[PDB]
Design a protein around this ligand. Structure first.
Ligand SMILES: [Cl-]
Ligand SMILES: [Cl-]
Ligand SMILES: [Mg+2]
Ligand SMILES: [Mg+2]
Lengths: 283, 283
């Protein structure tokens, strides 16, 4: 029967026992209120012998001005979806298990995190790096499955893993979308009917930019303007950024050569949404 | 035959194979030019099935004003001592293996490291935390043996291990001393005959402070003055700090209750030496 584990000590024991049987471990870190995007990561993780999903709304990666208190939470919904989709262990620690009274250590970095959302969200990537170092040490996974939707986060965590010699692989999985094109996110639940309609311009701008790139358009300023024109038609949308950047460095690019990450962040009403497309190996 | 390993990849392989046989691993991180202090850590580590010594003069933990370029180095001496003392693997990576071109991640903390040497050596503990996270991830040790001589470092690393959930134990081992009382350190090799004679006042001040404490002296200002009087007799000695602090927090203490770390840092000529005593469980 699937284990629902709230203790670090017990999670360690279970993983240690699985390792005693030379079983591989697939790990899907999440902040709960699960959706088909998460289920897609789980499906990939089932290539491994055992699958772990963590659920933890990590307070370190939210700032004071953001949505920690309202973040959607429904642990019964999540347990059921993990149960129905063949998850072996749902690890749901609370902040008192993860961060003891005198906790004071962190993991951070001096490149990558200063761009895109990192520039808009001070402290965010330190929160991500620190909590994932902890989870990786607790759970000892072999492959960690992450969504391309958080593209910068994937690159940041990959770089941390490289730099700190974590003996595991980060596997980036494609963006899963709603029927109407909106990238799956737990924050979608915040949107009003009218905001939901407005929010489709984000994915529209992504589909168009990707088509332009694959049709051989190299000038990023041309592409950005085209996305901007789509997004500016929606009064409910306030653009945070639209940037085409190198996928490995997050540095803005003026002319596309081998690759591009085209990334958008925008507020739809008060809700902050992100989306992107990624093209690699261009001639 | 003992393995001398310069590659991360090969070190990983060897450790993975040992683990496939359920062997425990004892690890002694060092910066080489080995002495009896190190040999003592190795002796403790031999409680484990396999013993690893790393040798790496980690550039991250030295500042511009310190002694990175002159740090004693004699890898043939070290290999022989490891060989003769039953070490299984000497891991000697170079900075190009550990720190690749675009390396930019670090581990640091917001308590403990701001006191004692930490205050005198900006960036030092970040260098220690970061390189040890890497070694721990590479070598997957069960117990890591460290000398009490670097008492703050032991407490810092213990706290990192706790906070980041490293699945290992830090074992602090007592100070090994020269016949004349000077705490063993590779930096002792820098001392002139006259500096060596002067340097004995450091251990003398430690022996006296510990005797005063164990004789029931609680007033730290009295104890510090007594140490200061010994040290001020030596013209070649410039005191950096003399502090009696709580062993768990590194906070200065005015009146001793259950514990005390009495720590000294002083320059003898240009060489910076440290020493301490530790008393725990007092009534
Ligand atoms: Cl989400
Ligand atoms: Cl030394
Ligand atoms: Mg592993
Ligand atoms: Mg281990």
């Amino acid at each position: 029967a699937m284990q629902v584990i709230t203790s670090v000590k017990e999670a360690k024991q279970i993983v240690k026992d699985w390792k005693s049987h030379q079983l591989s471990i697939g790990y899907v870190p999440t902040m709960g209120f699960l959706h088909d995007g998460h289920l897609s990561l789980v499906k990939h993780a089932k290539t491994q012998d055992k699958v772990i999903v963590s659920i933890f709304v990590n307070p370190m990666q939210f700032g004071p001005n953001e949505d920690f208190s309202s973040y959607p939470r429904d642990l019964e919904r999540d347990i059921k979806m993990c149960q129905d989709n063949g998850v072996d262990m749902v690890f749901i620690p609370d902040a008192t298990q993860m961060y003891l009274k005198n906790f004071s250590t962190y993991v951070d970095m001096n490149t990558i995190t200063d761009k895109l959302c990192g520039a808009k969200r001070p402290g965010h990537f330190r929160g991500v790096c620190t909590v994932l170092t902890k989870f990786f040490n607790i759970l000892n996974p072999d492959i960690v499955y992450m969504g391309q939707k958080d593209a910068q986060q994937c690159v940041v965590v990959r770089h941390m893993v490289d730099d700190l010699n974590f003996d595991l692989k980060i596997q980036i999985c494609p963006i899963i979308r709603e029927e109407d094109g909106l990238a799956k996110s737990s924050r979608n639940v915040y949107l009003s009917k009218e905001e939901r309609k407005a929010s489709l311009a984000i994915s529209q701008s992504i589909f168009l930019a990707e088509k332009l790139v694959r049709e051989g358009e190299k000038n990023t300023s041309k592409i950005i303007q085209a996305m901007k024109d789509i997004l500016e038609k929606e009064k409910l949308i306030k653009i945070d950024y639209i940037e085409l950047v190198d996928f490995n460095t997050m540095e803005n690019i003026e002319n596309i050569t081998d690759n591009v990450l085209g990334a958008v962040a925008a507020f739809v009403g008060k809700t902050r949404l992100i989306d992107n497309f990624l093209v690699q190996g261009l001639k």
